[PDB]
From a paper:
The [name]-like proteins are essential for expansion of the phogophore membrane and mediate targeting and assembly of protein complexes to the autophagosome. The mATG8s bind target proteins through a conserved [name]-interacting region (LIR). Members of the TRIM protein family are characterized by a conserved N-terminal domain architecture consisting of a RING domain, which confers E3 ubiquitin ligase activity; one or two Bbox domains; and a coiled-coil region. In these experiments [name]α was proposed to act as a selective autophagy receptor, targeting a restricted virus to the autophagosome for degradation.
To do this, we utilized a construct of [name]α from Rhesus macaque encompassing the Bbox coiled-coil regions with an E120K/R121D mutation (RhT5 88–296 EK/RD) that blocks the higher-order assembly of the protein, and [name] expressed in Escherichia coli. Crystals of a complex between RhT5 88–296 EK/RD and [name] were obtained and harvested for X-ray diffraction analysis. Two copies of RhT5 88–296 EK/RD and two copies of [name] are present in the asymmetric unit (full data collection and model refinement statistics are presented in Table 1). Here, it is the side chain of [name]α Trp196 that protrudes away from the coiled coil and occupies the large hydrophobic pocket of [name]. Instead, the side chain of Gln203 is located above the pocket with the side chain amide making a hydrogen bond with the backbone carboxyl of Leu53 in strand β2 of [name]. Glu192 forms a salt bridge with Lys51 on strand β2 of [name], Glu197 forms a hydrogen bond with His27 at the C terminus of helix α2 from [name], and Glu206 forms potential salt bridges with Arg69 and Arg70 at the C terminus of helix α3. The structure now presented here demonstrates a second mode of binding where a helical motif occupies the same binding groove on the surface of [name] with the large hydrophobic pocket similarly occupied.
Author numbering:
A (entry chain A): 95 to 287
B (entry chain C): 4 to 117
C (entry chain B): 95 to 277, 280 to 287
D (entry chain D): 4 to 116
């Protein structure tokens, strides 16, 4: 077509401005002093140059699509890694909870063993106490029979019973008070965290 | 309701046994659960027991009877690995060395009727 | 009654042997040299002595029953104390388990926040990458249109496009690898 | 099935609040449970949540949506103490200072039916 500024054909090419113009634009101050050629002169050169540029751009676009696929696969791999780490943390906390359960069971069994020992000791002492109470009751019954019956009943072997009562040492029960300890885990792990 | 072997994997159970043996070497770890189809007895809250070595089966049986709150007349069966060997006089160390599981724990079950 | 050893009545009492005997037992070697009285002489004395002994034994038996009740009450109190201590220990372990749950939840939320941040960053980088790929496609289409069309189409403003392709610096996506950590059984060692 | 206030006593819960606030001062403790009679939604495994201070309700809503494994189209209601006040833009610090329970925790419930 023709030029918009002057009206002549656009058959020229400015090496400096890279714009097609007319002959009137070449002499004006707008394109003064530049080097001007014909459009048909540089056609093949710029054609092969742009062909090589197209080759480079095709290769670079292939590389860029490969890069896109790479970043997609990477974010997939990272979500997988995060899932792995979450499962790992949950498993570690479960391990801690299990060993805590075991320690609790150990402490409970220790306390039950201590209770068993204390109870068996107190049961033996209570057996001794009830035996001595029954002995007292038996002696009381014998003295009653002595005081109600015959004179020969009253006097036969009376010194033996008197001496048996003279050695009346009453037995005290076994006891213990607040001489035990059973400490659990102190919240020092909270400071450790 | 999942059993012990269903709540934890095999390697996890072996690691638990190792940690317990490192912490309490003088004690034996025992897992005690109710029978699959026994109804007369309830389910205990606790599942794990650390039993001293010198202790015999009698102390473990009486501990289980006290935890279950049972009178002396009513009896129950305590099977090891699914087969009875309640030689009450034997020490628990021999029971552990003879009937322990592959992972390292000692599994027992309590039942009663039939 | 009569004596089994001699056959005479038992009307005497030996102060030394405390046995009732007969007069033949007094002269024999069994009770020789001992002091012998009549039962009626010491009857009242031994009666009042045994009466006071019965009183004392009643008091002492009451005291012994008190001691029995005391040891019973003590064993009851000790069973109560043991139950209290067991409940206390179980409650402390439950407290530990609760704070363990809270710490686990905190760590899980931290990891989820990290995952969200990483994913949004990678999504922004992927947006940049798809934009640059579309720009490459646009430039390829423009060069095709230049090479197929008119001569003026091929030549007008060609140096601008050439220089734009000269400055083709392809942009890399953001990435990270193995610079994170999760998380120790020191409580096992402390015991 | 027992709720949180039934599994722990009041003084125990107050002590838990105190210890947590001593350990995590920059975070708020929140108890979130499913409704008593909700069937359309599953039960989350985790019950306790520590939410940062500067964070608003939107992040908590997104956390619950991520935990529940829900598609974007279906929405759900998150009530506080059994009554909605979902000013989504407000920071959770104001929600804590306004609607926290007597023990010190912040109780929430999720439903959709
Ligand atoms: Zn012109
Ligand atoms: Zn020019
Ligand atoms: Zn005689
Ligand atoms: Zn004599």
């Amino acid at each position: 077509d023709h030029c918009a500024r002057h009206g002549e054909k656009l058959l020229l090419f400015c090496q400096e401005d890279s714009k097609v113009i007319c002959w009137l634009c070449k002499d004006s101050q707008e394109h003064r002093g530049h080097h001007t050629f014909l459009m048909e002169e540089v056609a093949q050169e710029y054609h092969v140059k742009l062909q090589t540029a197209l080759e480079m751009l095709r290769q670079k676009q292939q590389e860029a699509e490969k890069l896109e696929a790479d970043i997609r696969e990477e974010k997939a791999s990272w979500k997988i890694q995060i899932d792995y780490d979450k499962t790992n943390v949950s498993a570690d906390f479960e391990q801690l909870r299990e060993i805590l359960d075991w320690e609790e069971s150990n402490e409970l069994q220790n306390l039950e063993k201590e209770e068993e020992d204390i109870l068996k000791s107190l049961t033996k002492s209570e057996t001794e106490m009830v035996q001595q109470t029954q002995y007292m009751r038996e002696l009381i019954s014998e003295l009653e029979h002595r005081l109600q019956g015959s004179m020969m009943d009253l006097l036969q072997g009376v010194d033996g019973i008197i001496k048996r009562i003279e050695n009346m040492t009453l037995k005290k029960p076994k006891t213990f008070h607040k001489n035990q300890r059973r400490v659990f885990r102190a919240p020092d792990l909270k400071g450790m965290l | 309701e999942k059993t012990f072997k269903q709540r934890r994997t095999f390697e996890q159970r072996v690691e638990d046994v190792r940690l317990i043996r490192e912490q309490h070497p003088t004690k034996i770890p025992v897992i005690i659960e109710r029978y699959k189809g026994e109804k007369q007895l309830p389910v205990l809250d606790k599942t794990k027991f650390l039993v001293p070595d010198h202790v015999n089966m009698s102390e473990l049986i009486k501990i289980i009877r006290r935890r279950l709150q049972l009178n002396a007349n009513q009896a129950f069966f305590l099977l090891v690995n699914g087969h009875s060997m309640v030689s009450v006089s034997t020490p628990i160390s021999e029971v552990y060395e003879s009937e322990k599981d592959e992972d390292g724990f000692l599994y027992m079950v309590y039942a009663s009727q039939e």
